[PDB]
Design a protein around this ligand. Structure first.
Ligand SMILES: *[C@@H]1O[C@H](CO)[C@@H](O[C@@H]2O[C@H](CO)[C@@H](O[C@@H]3O[C@H](CO)[C@@H](O)[C@H](O)[C@H]3NC(C)=O)[C@H](O)[C@H]2NC(C)=O)[C@H](O)[C@H]1NC(C)=O
Ligand SMILES: *[C@@H]1O[C@H](CO)[C@@H](O[C@@H]2O[C@H](CO)[C@@H](O)[C@H](O)[C@H]2NC(C)=O)[C@H](O)[C@H]1NC(C)=O
Ligand SMILES: *[C@@H]1O[C@H](CO)[C@@H](O[C@@H]2O[C@H](CO)[C@@H](O)[C@H](O)[C@H]2NC(C)=O)[C@H](O)[C@H]1NC(C)=O
Ligand SMILES: *[C@@H]1O[C@H](CO)[C@@H](O[C@@H]2O[C@H](CO)[C@@H](O)[C@H](O)[C@H]2NC(C)=O)[C@H](O)[C@H]1NC(C)=O
Ligand SMILES: *[C@@H]1O[C@H](CO)[C@@H](O[C@@H]2O[C@H](CO)[C@@H](O)[C@H](O)[C@H]2NC(C)=O)[C@H](O)[C@H]1NC(C)=O
Ligand SMILES: *[C@@H]1O[C@H](CO)[C@@H](O[C@@H]2O[C@H](CO)[C@@H](O)[C@H](O)[C@H]2NC(C)=O)[C@H](O)[C@H]1NC(C)=O
Ligand SMILES: *[C@@H]1O[C@H](CO)[C@@H](O[C@@H]2O[C@H](CO)[C@@H](O)[C@H](O)[C@H]2NC(C)=O)[C@H](O)[C@H]1NC(C)=O
Ligand SMILES: CCCCCCCCCCCCCCCC(=O)O
Ligand SMILES: CCCCCCCCCCCCCCCC(=O)O
Ligand SMILES: *[C@@H]1O[C@H](CO)[C@@H](O)[C@H](O)[C@H]1NC(C)=O
Ligand SMILES: *[C@@H]1O[C@H](CO)[C@@H](O)[C@H](O)[C@H]1NC(C)=O
Ligand SMILES: *[C@@H]1O[C@H](CO)[C@@H](O)[C@H](O)[C@H]1NC(C)=O
Ligand SMILES: *[C@@H]1O[C@H](CO)[C@@H](O)[C@H](O)[C@H]1NC(C)=O
Ligand SMILES: *[C@@H]1O[C@H](CO)[C@@H](O)[C@H](O)[C@H]1NC(C)=O
Ligand SMILES: *[C@@H]1O[C@H](CO)[C@@H](O)[C@H](O)[C@H]1NC(C)=O
Ligand SMILES: *[C@@H]1O[C@H](CO)[C@@H](O)[C@H](O)[C@H]1NC(C)=O
Ligand SMILES: *[C@@H]1O[C@H](CO)[C@@H](O)[C@H](O)[C@H]1NC(C)=O
Ligand SMILES: *[C@@H]1O[C@H](CO)[C@@H](O)[C@H](O)[C@H]1NC(C)=O
Ligand SMILES: *[C@@H]1O[C@H](CO)[C@@H](O)[C@H](O)[C@H]1NC(C)=O
Ligand SMILES: *[C@@H]1O[C@H](CO)[C@@H](O)[C@H](O)[C@H]1NC(C)=O
Lengths: 290, 760, 48, 145, 48
């Protein structure tokens, strides 16, 4: 049939609806009202773990303190988007970046993401200082710029703590809030089951690529896994029966790869819709559901 | 001069595929097609010298000494300037309506010189001649030997200038009385037609619009194609003639014509154009009427690679990754080691042993000449497994084993795989775990170093005594029989047994009548890491890598074969030196004989994406993950138009972005919010209106920050005006319900298919 | 005939395996259309 | 195709190659065979349906005369700066040394040369009845076989 | 005359006539079955 035209069109359409899901999640930057916070201590609440550390020289960090601690616990292979074709020639076969250098011997490509790390550092900085007008009003159309320290005490008054307890225990509540943000950076271990899902997505991304490159060294019952050896040892009526085994074995691997990419693309599109509901309810508001 | 290039959007020069007709589809085809925007070669004819009341000598060009090479076939564009005005080429100041003139061809296998004119362009054997005649109404094709005559300037001459044909249309093209043998007569004045094997005629209709004529050759003969076939109003060429010319045509020649019109009636004739055919891949679109409307040469540029890689003509603006459809003719890199000759001398001297006591020779680290060995015998059977007999004399192996014995080839069915009798049970069982061959030969009488025995012999029994009868001891594959020490005492008669108490064996002998016959079993072993049993070769310099570095070559290095590109690296040490492999067993590197290390890449390695904008119909190219200095060295994987733009170095040049090298782009300083052509890493492509693409950046704004005032209350932004906004959304609730008749789908109502489907 | 059989059993398996995927996805999506009718069309939503 | 279906089908073309050939050399016409028959004389083409018949001409058939010697080529090469450059047959095509072979071979291993090419023949006499080889090739198409 | 999937959908005969060619099993058939009364009826879908 017209086999390769339909493999090309399926993966092109999968990569297109991957870009329309990221662009929808990031389109709240252009409409969100925001207030500026202070660098380090807002009232008595220490927010330094969540802020980007400012610098004198023009390096302009794109990573907060807790984000720089989470990214250096995950083992991701650098894909070399700029000049990765020549980096695979200066080094030999280092077998930890081997399915990164197998793009140029198997025949696939890892495409760069839609936004660089400076755009997604602007998405989470607008999530930290969103205005979100006052929490006794109906509607979503006014924006009340009350400080961070005062809007935490309105979230504690909403769950059933009176104003006479909140006024006598300001410092104790601030201390208990401060030593719960200092304990987030001791939870990036293999016992933490919510951190083990960050690594299991990295591993799932890499296991798909190694099942593509490993199906090219199988012989599938032929005399060799190489077409240039079948053409050199047999004659014209025996070559067609042995090449038809490699063809059948390699059409099965491509079908199994393309059929898994669509499953993972739909599952990641449904899960970026859950991240919008969890931002609009937990991050920008207060939840009334357990 | 009047350039008329090939236009594939009208399907110019495309021969319709044989078989049936299609409608409302687009499909890919591999065949003989012209290049896109190829200029071809222009051939201009004219009228000869004419006076009032007189017809003088002919006016021609140097066309009858040009010998072009045929090599695939060609197509001819005829009469593209009909009904227009133009020069009568003999007098360029005279303007007349231009007419159509058909070409005449001479095609042959051998060429020489016209003696004693001593010029060039003489076809000397059977030659195929194609002539138009009858004022363009008839076409002769014949295949004769041309003998040059002996008259004044009739081609066997010291005064012969050039072959040139002519017509006198005031006599020949009188209306109703067309002389349909006039040009044939003018041809017969030049040559004698000796031993003509065929002669065919085809009838044309005189009309002047525009047409095409093609000619190719294969093992069914010479095929002629015409655009006049089945509709004159299109560009498609259809098959109308096959000529029985089975030898390979190498050369052709356009015969110069010069029409002897009267001087008062000087006409103009439209030049014709010849385009060569190439083995190309094309994309063809068939309309409702069945005619090919447009085509795409899939190796011309990157938009064509996009259209042929996704197999459609309308491509829907985007950024696409594409495949390669270019030919890029390869070279050769052969490098094997020198050793001594393998000695087959204990096979050609002495008496060949019996089958149960066969002889085995194992060769490693030598050069063999299997032709020299097999030339001494008369082969009557050559049966192989996982190798062919022809490839056995050209391969490089790690070991080579020959078992041989004497054996009469009337018992040839007892050595077959899985055979019945006592040959496979007690004498010899062949081993089929390696590639192997079985030769059965006769020793001719002139070969006198091979003595013959007196009796063929084989074992019929080998057993141990047991408490109940006999316990037979069968052969293992490739192994000797266990009764071999018991068989060395010899058998003087048929069914003569020998016993050592524990074992017992029985032999059968019968005399040798005629020549001696022998059996050879050859087994080879291919390995990696330097196959050392290699064939004998003559030496040649050219197979090296010092010159042809960054091109695709077909290599054969110490027994390892493949295709690839070799690049200069500086790398790996440790002592497996010769071949470096990946974790998926790819030849990633090679340690050469001189001193150098090379990186090995496949023949198509660099990734290519094309950015396409439909509203302006523009495109640009991105080589992802490649630095812009490697692109100008490896400019042979790419398309036909990318190679010339790379080699010219005269454009908006290659640009280094954060996602690879970019061709057709320009640095900009503009910042966009939405993006229709995203490149990755917050880069966007801006299509031209400018004349090239530009590169912009994605920066989202943010509404301005409301800062807290220092007072008792707070600030709140409250609306003072509003509108109503409408958001649209589609939710799918159902799909189309389909039931399949599985029996009719798979087997189509055939009972032989339906019994094979029960096994699943 | 065993080649045509093997080639046509693969197409039917790939068709039947895709119809079940699309049927489950369209059944989950008609449950979303009930929630969107009962909340947006017949009532007024308090969630952004 | 089968031999039985060859006499009942409708084709678009039908090609027969034929020559004289002794059927004790029957293993040299096989697919992928070793010697000088497939290299310099005849290589069969397996891209179409095809058949290979090996027959003997009986004595009552008197319109077929017999020759005096079976003959085949053993060499066809160009001289080079290092040895010989052999010119192998293509499938279905004649040998390039065909004009050089028309002068005839009167003895075994009698060479002929045109300067650029060189060829060698081998002859041996016909004993018994004459034997012949036929290669038949057919082509099924659509649109009116 | 062929389809876009290369089926012989039609034929121009020798006399003067045109004929439509269909496969040997072409008409769809459904059966309506009721188990409580053990009854059945037939529907030839899309056929006049
Ligand atoms: C608009 O968006 C742009 C893209 O998101 C921002 O531009 C980015 O600025 C970064 C630094 O501020 C650059 O990082 C550099 O990347 C190169 C990669 O090769 C590194 O070598 C450099 O070290 C690194 N710079 C530093 C200081 O470490 C990004 O490359 C650059 N993006 C692009 C596409 O050029 C703009 O800052 C942003 N502008 C505004 C006003 O928001
Ligand atoms: C707010 O929190 C930050 C980080 O949790 C504190 O910064 C650390 O302070 C300790 C003790 O002074 C130092 O040893 C670390 O080097 C600091 N780390 C960083 C990243 O700054 C900060 O001191 C806290 N603020 C207050 C007022 O306690
Ligand atoms: C093709 O024509 C040439 C004529 O040039 C023929 O060559 C002659 O061959 C005979 C036979 O050996 C020689 O005696 C002559 O000397 C050749 N002619 C010349 C001029 O040298 C050749 O025979 C023809 N081809 C065939 C197949 O017959
Ligand atoms: C062109 O060739 C055809 C066929 O070879 C010729 O037609 C036949 O010619 C012979 C010889 O005169 C006649 O006996 C036949 O009666 C012709 N056949 C028919 C059907 O008429 C034809 O004459 C040739 N034409 C020219 C101009 O040479
Ligand atoms: C393999 O062996 C054959 C012998 O059968 C070699 O052929 C001989 O080569 C020499 C040197 O050119 C000639 O003088 C002889 O006339 C040839 N003999 C025959 C019978 O043709 C052949 O050269 C060897 N192959 C290689 C690659 O060396
Ligand atoms: C509400 O206050 C904000 C200040 O946070 C105003 O924004 C300023 O608007 C003026 C005039 O348009 C600009 O010159 C300033 O540069 C703005 N400042 C900032 C920080 O954006 C806003 O315009 C005010 N609203 C109204 C209706 O006046
Ligand atoms: C709210 O905005 C709308 C549109 O910006 C204003 O409508 C305009 O009113 C003026 C005066 O009546 C007209 O000349 C324009 O043609 C109107 N525009 C449109 C699009 O209808 C409206 O006046 C504003 N309301 C207030 C209170 O400012
Ligand atoms: C100098 C050593 C000679 C050894 C003795 C040579 C005797 C060889 C004759 C036996 C041939 C074996 C025949 C196999 C059976 C067959 O005819 O099929
Ligand atoms: C009238 C034309 C006769 C042409 C000359 C006829 C000579 C034919 C004899 C050669 C037969 C070829 C044998 C092939 C080799 C074989 O024996 O295997
Ligand atoms: C793989 O090889 C690299 C060097 O080529 C080495 O550093 C690494 O330790 C190896 N991997 C493992 C799991 O040991
Ligand atoms: C004319 O033909 C002769 C003979 O082939 C050739 O040498 C010459 O170059 C031709 N003239 C031109 C202008 O090419
Ligand atoms: C070329 O032909 C002429 C005859 O016109 C003859 O005199 C001359 O010798 C020939 N050239 C050679 C090199 O033989
Ligand atoms: C023409 O054919 C005859 C046989 O009838 C042959 O003798 C002669 O050599 C041939 N003519 C040429 C020029 O070869
Ligand atoms: C020339 O004129 C004829 C009739 O007038 C027409 O059919 C034909 O297409 C014309 N050719 C061109 C090239 O215009
Ligand atoms: C064997 O050699 C002799 C040498 O005189 C020769 O006459 C004879 O023909 C040869 N046998 C064969 C079959 O060629
Ligand atoms: C090939 O190598 C030989 C051996 O040194 C040398 O004599 C000859 O000139 C070389 N030829 C070419 C074309 O390099
Ligand atoms: C290495 O390869 C380059 C081609 O990129 C070539 O110019 C250079 O001469 C080579 N160096 C050596 C030492 O062979
Ligand atoms: C890239 O852009 C900058 C500023 O727009 C310009 O100075 C530079 O020349 C550009 N690079 C190239 C290769 O044109
Ligand atoms: C109020 O805030 C402004 C902000 O710049 C500051 O300059 C000023 O001193 C503050 N006044 C009081 C009374 O806090
Ligand atoms: C050949 O024909 C003759 C005619 O008399 C006949 O006697 C003879 O038997 C025939 N040969 C064969 C083998 O049938």
């Amino acid at each position: 049939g017209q086999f390769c035209s339909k493999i090309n069109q399926a993966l092109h359409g999968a990569n297109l609806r991957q870009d329309e899901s990221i662009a929808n999640l990031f389109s709240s930057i252009k409409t969100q009202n925001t207030q500026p916070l202070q660098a380090g201590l807002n009232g008595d609440f220490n927010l330094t773990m969540l802020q980007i550390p400012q610098v004198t020289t023009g390096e302009r960090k794109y990573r907060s303190t807790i984000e720089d601690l989470l990214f250096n616990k995950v083992t991701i292979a650098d894909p070399g988007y700029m000049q990765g074709y020549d980096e695979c020639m200066q080094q030999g076969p280092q077998s930890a970046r081997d399915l990164i250098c197998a793009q140029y011997v198997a025949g696939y490509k890892v495409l760069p993401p839609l936004y660089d790390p400076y755009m997604e550092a602007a998405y989470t900085s607008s999530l930290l200082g969103s205005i979100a007008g006052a929490s006794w009003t109906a509607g979503l159309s006014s924006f009340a710029a009350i400080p961070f320290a005062q809007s935490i005490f309105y979230r504690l008054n909403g769950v059933g703590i009176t104003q006479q307890v909140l006024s006598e225990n300001q410092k104790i509540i601030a201390n208990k809030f401060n030593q719960a943000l200092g304990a987030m950076q001791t939870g990036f271990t293999t016992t933490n089951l919510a951190f083990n899902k960050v690594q299991d997505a990295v591993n799932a991304n890499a296991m798909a690529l190694s099942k593509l490159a490993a199906e090219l060294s199988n012989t599938f019952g032929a005399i060799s896994s190489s077409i240039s050896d079948i053409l050199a040892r047999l004659d014209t009526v025996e070559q067609e029966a042995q090449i038809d085994r490699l063809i059948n074995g390699r059409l099965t691997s491509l079908n199994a790869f393309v059929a898994q990419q669509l499953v993972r693309t739909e599952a990641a599109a449904r899960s970026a819709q859950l991240a919008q509901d969890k931002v609009n309810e937990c991050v920008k508001s207060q939840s009334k559901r357990n | 001069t009047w350039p008329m290039p090939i236009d594939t959007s009208k399907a110019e020069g495309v021969i319709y595929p044989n078989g049936k007709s299609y409608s409302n589809i687009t499909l890919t085809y591999t065949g003989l097609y012209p290049k896109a925007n190829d200029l071809g070669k222009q051939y201009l004819f004219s009228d000869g010298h004419s006076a009032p009341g007189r017809l003088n000598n002919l006016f021609v060009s140097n066309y009858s000494s040009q010998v072009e090479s045929f090599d695939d076939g060609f197509v001819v564009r005829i009469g593209a300037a009909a009904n227009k005005t133009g020069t009568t080429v003999i007098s360029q100041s005279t303007f007349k309506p231009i007419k159509k003139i058909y070409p005449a061809f001479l095609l042959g296998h051998s060429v020489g010189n016209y003696t004693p004119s001593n010029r060039t362009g003489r076809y000397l054997n059977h030659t195929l001649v194609i002539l138009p005649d009858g004022c363009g109404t008839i076409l002769h094709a014949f295949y004769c030997v041309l003998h040059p005559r002996t008259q004044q300037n009739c081609a066997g001459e010291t005064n012969f200038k050039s072959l040139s044909l002519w017509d006198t249309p005031a006599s020949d093209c009188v209306s109703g009385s067309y002389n349909q043998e006039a040009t044939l007569g003018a041809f017969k004045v030049y040559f004698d037609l000796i031993n003509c094997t065929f002669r065919y005629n085809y009838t044309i209709t005189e009309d002047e619009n525009a047409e095409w004529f093609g000619i190719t050759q294969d093992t069914q003969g010479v095929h002629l194609y015409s655009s006049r076939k089945e509709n004159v109003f299109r560009n498609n060429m259809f098959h109308f003639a096959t000529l029985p010319v089975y030898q390979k045509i190498l050369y052709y020649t356009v015969i110069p014509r010069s029409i002897r019109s009267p001087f008062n009636d000087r006409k103009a004739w439209a030049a014709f154009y010849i385009y060569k055919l190439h083995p190309l891949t094309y994309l063809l679109n068939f309309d409702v009427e069945g005619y090919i409307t447009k085509a795409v040469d899939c190796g011309y540029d990157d938009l064509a690679q996009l259209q042929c890689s996704y197999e459609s003509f309308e491509v829907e603006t985007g950024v696409y990754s594409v495949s390669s459809f270019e030919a890029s003719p390869r070279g050769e890199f052969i490098e094997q080691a020198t050793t001594q000759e393998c000695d087959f001398t204990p096979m050609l001297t002495g008496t060949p042993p019996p089958i149960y006591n066969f002889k085995r020779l194992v060769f490693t680290n030598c050069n063999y000449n299997l032709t020299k060995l097999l030339s001494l015998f008369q082969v009557s059977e050559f049966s192989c497994h996982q190798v062919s007999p022809s490839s056995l004399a050209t391969g490089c192996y790690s070991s080579l084993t020959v078992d041989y014995f004497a054996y009469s080839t009337d018992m040839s069915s007892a050595l077959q795989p899985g055979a019945a009798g006592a040959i496979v049970q007690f004498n010899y069982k062949q081993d089929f775990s390696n590639p192997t061959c079985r030769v059965l030969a006769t020793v001719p009488q002139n070969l006198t170093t091979i003595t013959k025995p007196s009796n063929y012999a084989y074992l019929t029994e080998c057993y141990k005594t047991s408490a109940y009868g006999k316990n037979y001891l069968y052969n293992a594959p490739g192994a000797y029989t266990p009764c071999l020490s018991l068989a060395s005492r010899g058998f003087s008669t048929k069914y003569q047994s020998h016993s050592d108490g524990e074992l017992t064996t029985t032999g059968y002998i019968y005399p040798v009548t005629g020549n001696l016959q022998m059996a050879f079993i050859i087994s080879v072993q291919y390995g990696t890491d330097t196959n050392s049993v290699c064939p004998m070769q003559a030496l040649r310099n050219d197979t090296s890598i010092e010159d042809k570095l960054d091109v695709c070559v077909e290599y054969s290095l110490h027994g390892i074969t493949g295709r690839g590109v070799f690049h200069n690296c500086t790398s790996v040490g440790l002592r497996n030196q010769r071949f470096v492999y990946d974790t998926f067993d790819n030849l990633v590197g090679y340690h050469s004989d001189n001193g150098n290390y090379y990186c090995v890449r496949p023949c198509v390695s660099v990734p290519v994406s094309v950015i396409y904008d439909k509203a302006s119909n523009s495109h640009a190219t991105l080589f992802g993950s490649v630095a812009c200095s490697h692109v100008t060295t490896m400019m042979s994987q790419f398309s036909r138009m990318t190679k010339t733009n790379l080699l010219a170095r005269t454009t908006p040049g290659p640009l280094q972005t954060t996602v690879g090298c970019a061709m057709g782009f320009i640095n900009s300083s503009m910042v966009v919010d939405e993006c229709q052509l995203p490149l990755g890493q917050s880069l966007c492509a801006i299509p031209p209106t400018s004349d090239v693409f530009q590169i912009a950046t994605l920066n989202f704004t943010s509404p301005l920050t409301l800062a807290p005032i220092n007072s008792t209350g707070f600030v709140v932004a409250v609306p003072t005006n509003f509108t109503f906004g409408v958001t649209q959304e589609f939710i799918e609730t159902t799909i189309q319900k389909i039931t399949v008749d599985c029996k009719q789908y798979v087997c189509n109502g055939f009972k032989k298919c339906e019994d094979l489907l029960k096994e699943y």
